[PDB]
Amino acid sequence: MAATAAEAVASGSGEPREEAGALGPAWDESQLRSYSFPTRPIPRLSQSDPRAEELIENEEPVVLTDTNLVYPALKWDLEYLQENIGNGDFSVYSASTHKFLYYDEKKMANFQNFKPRSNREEMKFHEFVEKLQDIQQRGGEERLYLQQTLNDTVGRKIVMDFLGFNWNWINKQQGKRGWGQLTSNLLLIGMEGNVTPAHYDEQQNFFAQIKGYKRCILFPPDQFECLYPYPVHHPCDRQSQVDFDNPDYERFPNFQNVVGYETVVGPGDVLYIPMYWWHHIESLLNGGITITVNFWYKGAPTPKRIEYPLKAHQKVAIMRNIEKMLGEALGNPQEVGPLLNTMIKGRYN
Amino acid sequence: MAATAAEAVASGSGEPREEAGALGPAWDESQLRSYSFPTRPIPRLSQSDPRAEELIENEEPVVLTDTNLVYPALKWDLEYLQENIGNGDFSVYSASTHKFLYYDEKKMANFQNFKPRSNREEMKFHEFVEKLQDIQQRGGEERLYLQQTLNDTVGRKIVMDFLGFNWNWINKQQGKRGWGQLTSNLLLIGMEGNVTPAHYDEQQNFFAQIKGYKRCILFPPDQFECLYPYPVHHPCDRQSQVDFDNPDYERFPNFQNVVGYETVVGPGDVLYIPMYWWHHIESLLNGGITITVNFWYKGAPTPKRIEYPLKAHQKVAIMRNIEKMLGEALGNPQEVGPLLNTMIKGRYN
Amino acid sequence: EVVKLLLEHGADVXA
Amino acid sequence: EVVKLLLEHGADVXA
Ligand SMILES: O=C(O)CNC(=O)C(=O)O
Ligand SMILES: O=C(O)CNC(=O)C(=O)O
Ligand SMILES: [Zn+2]
Ligand SMILES: [Zn+2]
Secondary structure (H helix, E strand, O other): OHHHHHHHHOOOOOOOOEOHHHOOEOOOHHHOOOOOOOEEEOOEEOOOOHHHHHHHHOOOOEEEOOOOOOHHHHHOOHHHHHHHOOOOEEEEEEEOOOEOOOOOHHHHOOOOOOOOOEEEEEEEHHHHHHHHHHHHHOOOOOEEEEEEEOOOOOOHHHHHHHHOOOHHHHHHHHHHOOOOOEEEOEEEEEOOOOEEEEEOOOOEEEEEEEEOOEEEEEEOHHHHHHHOEOOOOOOOOOEEOOOOOOOOOOOOHHHHHOOEEEEEEOOOOEEEEOOOOEEEEEEOOOOOOEEEEEEEEOOOOOOOOOOOOOOHHHHHHHHHHHHHHHHHHHOOHHHHHHHHHHHHOOOOO | OHHHHHHHHOOOOOOOOEOHHHOOEOOOHHHOOOOOOOEEEOOEEOOOOHHHHHHHHOOOOEEEOOOOOOHHHHHOOHHHHHHHOOOOEEEEEEEOOOEOOOOOHHHHOOOOOOOOOEEEEEEEHHHHHHHHHHHHHOOOOOEEEEEEEOOOOOOHHHHHHHHOOOHHHHHHHHHHOOOOOEEEOEEEEEOOOOEEEEEOOOOEEEEEEEEOOEEEEEEOHHHHHHHOEOOOOOOOOOEEOOOOOOOOOOOOHHHHHOOEEEEEEOOOOEEEEOOOOEEEEEEOOOOOOEEEEEEEEOOOOOOOOOOOOOOHHHHHHHHHHHHHHHHHHHOOHHHHHHHHHHHHOOOOO | OHHHHHHOOOOOOOO | OHHHHHHOOOOOOOO
């Protein structure tokens, strides 16, 4: 049966891999949250494996097992970082729940009636660490997620580690793909169970896992239809409106057709998250703190001669641009939806 | 009651006016087709009446009773025209029914499955006249409507008449409104009962009635919502998809909210049809042949400083432009609807 | 420039 | 020019 072949081709992230030295499973399926859609496994390859090069060239996700991209950072943990990350401020988001939905603060104006679900607080690294310990100590249910662009202020030893990244490998990758400049390295330190909801990014991303384990669910740009992004002017622009924990199939019917690419990344894995691909990211339940550094590159420039029919991501670019232009042209983001309905109701169904 | 005041403020085209010399009603209400919406009467004013100037300046419809715009043309009838209109070809549309739906022939390609409802045939004026007489003679049910831009070929006396138009009046009007150039004069000769379905034009129009009587139903550009124009790339671009004789309220629910401005124009009336205003035009039942000449002017140019919020017609311009750009950008008109639904389903409802 | 782009109108009439 | 206008993409990331 083709359903039969399909039911097992939804292997998720495969059987948990065994750590070297017979250290038993690093995780087990019970630490993954339960969702309603099938997924297939993102392949885990060697960086010298040509198939992995073929996937990156084609802008498909792959987990590279052996880049050494952030090899010096694998000794990172809270104690080390607090002694050497320096006295700069770090952006930390606080949430009552396990889904951190983010917001573009600038867009906070036009929509008055959005109410934030997680607040952001600036603090020195040592305060963040203490604030974690506190919550831990008092068995509290609060949740914190630190996300900060690594900046000049970082201490001596963190710079030394940084220089030890495998710039040769990723530099060549930037060249080979015609990508733009590296815009930033985002440091993410998460509490176990933390969820970043499905969203896509307007940059290419090499996602370098450092401590703990993150389950990554990806969807191709061609499943825009099933994922229902917030309006472009909305503070949650680029995130799915679908609550993966309780999907409203009445509002979002095509979410019943979504199929995900999935993987678990641990210390030393690099996950290529192609530009425009949706990703949902959860730090495994009872896995401890997680640490990731990503590398965000501006995407390749638009080609001289456009080849038709358009790829899916180009259509996302177009739709985004249509909403932006109507926003400016009407004098008000809030008339975009009304104009758009006038335009299709009874004309394009 | 405000419903009471409303039920009589839907006066339609008023009581039929009595012709000079006590010649009884020129028409009676029984010669108007029956429709489902209320209408109010377009005012009939003198060209020296400042209110009429106020309406034109504000781009609202008005019937000017005394322009003499086409005074020399009032002697026109079929016999005169056939003796002097010259031997050029005239475009004539043929229909099985009384609604002439037109088509942009160039757009006939992209949509294969549209089938024309009325065909066009080129013929010399004298053939058109004979073809009318024939249908008349044989009691046939066929319908013909001649519509031809008046061109160089017209005979000596038709040019003399043309020079006798009140260019002073309309020239000043063109100036006073900053309009563009006069692009054309369309001659329309209709069989009694002929209907031109609701549509809007991208030019300002002084509609100069010559022979017979035409009922004109207008709707403001702000009732775009209720009138459901064909997609821009569709051969019937700019016409309503609503069949006024049998409106499908399931497909076009807001047609139940449409309110029309209405009038009957007879020999010597000029109806200012403002750019973007919808108009539905019927030659009265058993009224005989009708003759109109219109004057189409390019509209005023876009203003240096845009004043917000936008007027309704500007929003029609915008929507039109959005559909055109997606058409080009996607490589195919036929993907415009699909992209547009992807964009709103579950995002702007 | 964007606004004025979307505000330009063609001049299509009748057929 | 039109096509390439609508194909240009911003570079928005995370928050
Ligand atoms: O790792 C996370 O929780 C969130 N990170 C991203 O979405 C990203 O790396 O682009
Ligand atoms: O008079 C008619 O039947 C049709 N004419 C028009 O729609 C026009 O004049 O712009
Ligand atoms: Zn017209
Ligand atoms: Zn991301």
